[PDB]
Design a protein around this ligand. Structure first.
Ligand SMILES: NC(=O)C1=CN([C@@H]2O[C@H](COP(=O)(O)OP(=O)(O)OC[C@H]3O[C@@H](n4cnc5c(N)ncnc54)[C@H](OP(=O)(O)O)[C@@H]3O)[C@@H](O)[C@H]2O)C=CC1
Ligand code: NA
Length: 358
């Protein structure tokens, strides 16, 4: 009689033990005419998933989940994590025009929506794209969240594109993870010269992906090494913290060189101080740092993941043209999501961890 479906959900924030498997998920529902229901075939685990499991961003994300303050506390639960999906379209609302049942699609889901570690996921038409024809679901599911994060930082915030990168020198701090391994490749597709900073053991990987130079950040003479290279037109910082104290100094000055960071206290400030005071603090940091770097002749920018079907269509074109490859470290069956989370939580990513749902 009833329709039941499967998911990994959490009922409270905490350590990995909060993960719970249920075969009693309700059927997915189209609430708005621009939504699409997708059968999840594969999903990837992202550090944002492990962090959100522990409560990270809860304050800000709850405001996003319920703008009106019309829901009660703990109303996000049960919460399905997972941001990436490769799969097949089951149903569309009446305003979706470019997708239909049976299409093979991928998407990155915003953090404030129910996630993809489930049999089905509801997404908005503007977040979804036809997946690369050349990739399996497993391969494709590794890409959307990291690719869109990289795209936001590089293209949208950085202003770099296929026409203006030729012979620009790019530094990627943290080149061996999900974002970095995508970033190396999109930058080489646009003919930039790429310097990758990563651990010694990742060096072969990042070179095969197209890194021109590699710096081992534990080599103990990173400064003399960077000092020995020409300056950079662009730095993508995926490490953060102390990197900001030395890395901007290696950009060309007074030439529109840009430092973009993906590691910010945006969500942490609101967790610690609340929405109003956290947002204030974030603004003070943003404003003082932008001006201070402007005075030293560089643009300093923050960048964030942003969901985009149209950007995914551009990415799928690069994949199918052979310019971007998926980099999958490991796959886990659906029954081993907790194990996949522990692996991610242990660190030292070399590309991506994918969950096979089908
Ligand atoms: N603002 C935003 O919207 C987003 C920000 N991000 C940021 O980027 C990271 C997540 O991205 P992702 O690419 O998926 O993460 P990963 O976990 O897949 O990759 C991070 C990589 O960084 C390496 N690393 C750690 N320390 C250093 C260092 N000091 N120098 C060079 N490499 C280092 C790790 O390897 P090893 O430790 O072995 O060197 C690992 O390969 C997080 O820090 C996250 O905040 C991610 C998504 C969205
Ligand atoms: Na598969």
């Amino acid at each position: 009689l009833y329709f039941q479906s499967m998911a990994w959900v959490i009922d409270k924030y905490g350590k990995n033990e909060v993960l719970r498997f249920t075969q009693n998920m309700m059927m997915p529902i189209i609430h708005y005419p621009n939504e699409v229901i997708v059968k999840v075939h594969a999903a990837s685990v992202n550090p944002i998933d492990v962090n959100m499991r522990s409560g990270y961003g809860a304050t800000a994300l709850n405001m996003k989940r319920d703008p009106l303050h019309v829901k009660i506390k703990g109303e996000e639960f049960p919460l399905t994590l997972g941001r990436d999906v490769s799969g097949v379209v089951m149903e569309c609302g009446l305003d979706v025009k470019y997708f239909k049942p049976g299409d093979e699609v991928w998407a990155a889901v915003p953090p404030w929506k129910q996630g993809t570690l489930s049999e089905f996921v509801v997404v908005s038409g503007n977040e979804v794209s036809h997946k690369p024809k050349s990739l399996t679901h497993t391969q494709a599911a590794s890409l959307p969240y990291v690719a869109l994060t990289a795209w936001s930082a590089i293209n949208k915030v950085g202003g770099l594109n296929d026409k203006n990168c030729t012979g620009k020198r790019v530094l990627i701090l943290g080149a061996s993870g999900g974002v970095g391994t995508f970033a190396i490749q999109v930058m080489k597709a646009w003919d930039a010269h790429v310097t990758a900073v990563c651990s010694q053991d990742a060096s072969e990987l990042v070179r095969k992906l197209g890194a021109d130079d590699v710096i081992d950040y534990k080599s103990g003479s990173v400064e003399e090494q960077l000092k020995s290279l020409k300056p950079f037109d662009f730095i993508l910082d995926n490490v953060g913290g102390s990197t900001e104290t030395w890395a901007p100094d290696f950009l060309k000055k007074w030439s529109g060189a840009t430092y973009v960071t993906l590691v910010t206290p945006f969500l942490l400030n609101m967790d610690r101080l609340g929405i109003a005071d956290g947002m204030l603090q974030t603004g003070v940091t943003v404003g003082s740092k932008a001006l201070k770097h402007f005075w030293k002749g560089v643009h300093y920018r923050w960048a964030f993941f942003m969901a985009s079907g149209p950007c995914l269509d551009d990415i799928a074109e690069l994949v199918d043209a052979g310019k971007i490859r998926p980099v999958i470290e490991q796959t886990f069956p659906f029954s081993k999501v907790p194990e996949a989370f522990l692996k991610v939580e242990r660190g030292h990513a070399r590309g991506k961890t994918v969950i096979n749902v089908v």
